[PDB]
PDB file of N, CA and C in Angstrom:
ATOM      1  N   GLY A 365     112.400 139.385  15.992  1.00 51.48           N
ATOM      2  CA  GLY A 365     113.530 139.148  15.135  1.00 51.48           C
ATOM      3  C   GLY A 365     113.671 140.292  14.160  1.00 51.48           C
ATOM      4  N   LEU A 366     112.601 141.050  14.038  1.00 53.99           N
ATOM      5  CA  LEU A 366     112.578 142.265  13.253  1.00 53.99           C
ATOM      6  C   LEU A 366     113.322 143.364  14.012  1.00 53.99           C
ATOM      7  N   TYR A 367     113.684 144.428  13.311  1.00 52.08           N
ATOM      8  CA  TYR A 367     114.404 145.571  13.915  1.00 52.08           C
ATOM      9  C   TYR A 367     113.656 146.132  15.142  1.00 52.08           C
ATOM     10  N   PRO A 368     112.311 146.405  15.054  1.00 52.27           N
ATOM     11  CA  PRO A 368     111.552 146.872  16.200  1.00 52.27           C
ATOM     12  C   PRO A 368     111.454 145.779  17.273  1.00 52.27           C
ATOM     13  N   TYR A 369     112.118 146.009  18.378  1.00 54.37           N
ATOM     14  CA  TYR A 369     112.157 145.069  19.477  1.00 54.37           C
ATOM     15  C   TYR A 369     110.842 145.098  20.259  1.00 54.37           C
ATOM     16  N   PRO A 370     110.465 143.987  20.913  1.00 56.97           N
ATOM     17  CA  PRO A 370     111.212 142.729  20.888  1.00 56.97           C
ATOM     18  C   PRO A 370     110.681 141.763  19.816  1.00 56.97           C
ATOM     19  N   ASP A 371     111.555 141.334  18.920  1.00 55.78           N
ATOM     20  CA  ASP A 371     111.210 140.414  17.833  1.00 55.78           C
ATOM     21  C   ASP A 371     112.488 140.154  17.055  1.00 55.78           C
TER      22      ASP A 371
END
């Protein structure tokens, strides 16, 4: 869900 995928 953060900018750095996947998240």
